[PDB]
Amino acid sequence: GSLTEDGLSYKEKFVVRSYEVGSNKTATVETIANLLQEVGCNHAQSVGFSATTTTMRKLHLIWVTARMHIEIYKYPAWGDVVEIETWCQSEGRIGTRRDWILKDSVTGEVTGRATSKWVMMNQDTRRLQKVSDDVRDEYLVFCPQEPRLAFPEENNRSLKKIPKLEDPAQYSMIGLKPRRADLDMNQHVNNVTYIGWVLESIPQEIVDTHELQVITLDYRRECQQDDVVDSLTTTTSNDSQFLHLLRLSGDGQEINRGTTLWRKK
Amino acid sequence: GSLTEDGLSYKEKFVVRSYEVGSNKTATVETIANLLQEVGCNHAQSVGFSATTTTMRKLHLIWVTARMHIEIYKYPAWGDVVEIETWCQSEGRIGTRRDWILKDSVTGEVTGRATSKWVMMNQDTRRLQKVSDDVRDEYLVFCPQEPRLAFPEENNRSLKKIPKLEDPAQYSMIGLKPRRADLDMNQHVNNVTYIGWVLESIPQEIVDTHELQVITLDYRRECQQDDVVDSLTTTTSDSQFLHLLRLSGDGQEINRGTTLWRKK
Ligand SMILES: Cn1cc(N)c(C(=O)NC2CCC2)n1
Numbered sequence: 001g002s003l004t005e006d007g008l009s010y011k012e013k014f015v016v017r018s019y020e021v022g023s024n025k026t027a028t029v030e031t032i033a034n035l036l037q038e039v040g041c042n043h044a045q046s047v048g049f050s051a052t053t054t055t056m057r058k059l060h061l062i063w064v065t066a067r068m069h070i071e072i073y074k075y076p077a078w079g080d081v082v083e084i085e086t087w088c089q090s091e092g093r094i095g096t097r098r099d100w101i102l103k104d105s106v107t108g109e110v111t112g113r114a115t116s117k118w119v120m121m122n123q124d125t126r127r128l129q130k131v132s133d134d135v136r137d138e139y140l141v142f143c144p145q146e147p148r149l150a151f152p153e154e155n156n157r158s159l160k161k162i163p164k165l166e167d168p169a170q171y172s173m174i175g176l177k178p179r180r181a182d183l184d185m186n187q188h189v190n191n192v193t194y195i196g197w198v199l200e201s202i203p204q205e206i207v208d209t210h211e212l213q214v215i216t217l218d219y220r221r222e223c224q225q226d227d228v229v230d231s232l233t234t235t236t237s238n239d240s241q242f243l244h245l246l247r248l249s250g251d252g253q254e255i256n257r258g259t260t261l262w263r264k265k
Numbered sequence: 266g267s268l269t270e271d272g273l274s275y276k277e278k279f280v281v282r283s284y285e286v287g288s289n290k291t292a293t294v295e296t297i298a299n300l301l302q303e304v305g306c307n308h309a310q311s312v313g314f315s316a317t318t319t320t321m322r323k324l325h326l327i328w329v330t331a332r333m334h335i336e337i338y339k340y341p342a343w344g345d346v347v348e349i350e351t352w353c354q355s356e357g358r359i360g361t362r363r364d365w366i367l368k369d370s371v372t373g374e375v376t377g378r379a380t381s382k383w384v385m386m387n388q389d390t391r392r393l394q395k396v397s398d399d400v401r402d403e404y405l406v407f408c409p410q411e412p413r414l415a416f417p418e419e420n421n422r423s424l425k426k427i428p429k430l431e432d433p434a435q436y437s438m439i440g441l442k443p444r445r446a447d448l449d450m451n452q453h454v455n456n457v458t459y460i461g462w463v464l465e466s467i468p469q470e471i472v473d474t475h476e477l478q479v480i481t482l483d484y485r486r487e488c489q490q491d492d493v494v495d496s497l498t499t500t501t502s503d504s505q506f507l508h509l510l511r512l513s514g515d516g517q518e519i520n521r522g523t524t525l526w527r528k529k
């Protein structure tokens with residue numbers, strides 16, 4: 001991969017691997033989620049990062065995902081090359097936004113797009129805070145000045161308020177635990193695991209006859225290595241829509257909430 | 266990736282990804298296991314396959330892993346390029362063997378090696394079958410004639426008989442279930458999940474102070490999508506462990522193995 005000519009975005013090509021595909025022989029949404037994560041890491045490394053700035057490590061501050069939104073028009077097949085372009089943008093003192101565009105390397109058409117909202121948090125106390133002026137200027141040089149939105153639309157699906165699932169849920173997957181493969185280099189559960197865990201409550205019949213089009217996920221609390229999750233789902237709707245909820249098995253503390261949209265094959 | 270000049274092996278370079286590494290910022294043994302699996306698929310595709318031969322698809326026959334053995338000297342770091350060379354060989358009518366050599370793309374040194382024993386099963390009845398001729402000949406053109414062994418040594422770790430763990434186990438991880446990410450394109454639990462599941466019973470204190478050097482795993486039975494596994498471990502000794510994966514209910518054995526760890 002490499003930065004574009006202006007140095008205000010990064011591109012990377014990935015060949016889809018055999019273990020990265022599902023039953024339809026196309027990449028899973030978790031493979032896509034992993035690829036977006038990977039290109040974001042390479043973008044951060046290519047501009048002198050490790051993505052904590054000078055003032056962030058001084059104050060023990062980290063970026064945390066608050067929301068992920070992914071829309072896929074076509075899933076790349078096993079053996080195909082997918083090109084992903086990623087960039088970041090300041091959202092004032094609220095946090096940062098990271099966008100992605102997925103393309104077929106052969107045709108050059110947009111086969112998917114994603115958007116994420118990141119908030120600043122103290123690594124130790126876990127307390128959210130607004131972006132300071134000294135920190136905002138440190139990352140502003142790596143961002144476009146004019147708005148560059150992967151989801152421009154005057155009423156897009158990425159900004160909708162997600163309601164909380166009411167008990168009883170229509171479908172559920174109980175007793176979900178993360179293994180060492182689910183943890184990142186800092187021993188925290190990878191953000192992509194929550195996506196997989198959310199989808200565990202969707203019935204296998206829907207997965208066999210439908211393709212996942214859109215997924216919106218709100219990250220409320222992190223699941224520890226020794227925590228147990230419960231995935232809950234209810235159909236709300238040629239298109240099926242679901243409301244989702246991930247919570248701790250014990251106290252029932254909410255850790256994630258979201259919605260998915262599926263279309264008939 | 267591509268086949269070598271003689272067409273009797275395949276090579277491929279992989280850049281280690283950020284989500285593929287552990288706390289030491291080096292690739293996990295499951296990332297390595299995934300890479301070996303991937304290079305084996307590309308090798309099979311590059312020589313005209315869909316590794317099912319002509320006779321095999323007519324008879325509803327598949328290759329299944331009976332044994333996996335991996336030895337790592339150095340784990341590639343996040344950002345490093347690892348080159349893997351893989352090849353197949355016949356072992357008479359008992360089955361097939363697949364070997365791998367892992368190398369650092371910069372220095373060219375051997376940083377790891379693996380060997381696997383594959384047996385021929387009937388997809389539907391799940392019944393083991395010996396490798397008859399005709400199907401033996403159909404694939405012997407893609408294999409070296411003289412023995413090419415990643416583990417040559419007479420009396421090496423890859424050929425040792427693994428005993429069955431006795432109850433009670435010293436360490437255990439219970440209630441393990443596969444998710445959709447753990448399944449392959451045919452909806453079967455990926456062989457690499459069993460490796461991860463085996464390692465779930467190793468205490469986090471050993472993982473934090475030791476590096477995994479060798480792992481030998483015997484595949485006895487497949488775990489279904491709706492099955493629940495129990496991972497059991499006992500220290501037998503460098504630290505050495507005896508492992509056992511079994512179904513939560515009936516306690517049916519699905520996998521057994523051993524791991525060797527060195528102090529950091
Ligand atoms: C720690 N980190 C770096 C990233 N680039 C991501 C990231 O984009 N995560 C989302 C969740 C679906 C992919 N997370």
Ligand SMILES: Cn1cc(N)c(C(=O)NC2CCC2)n1
Binds near residue numbers: 303305381
């Ligand atoms: C379906 N398939 C093709 C392969 N080449 C492998 C394979 O080598 N798997 C082993 C166990 C983890 C490494 N499995």
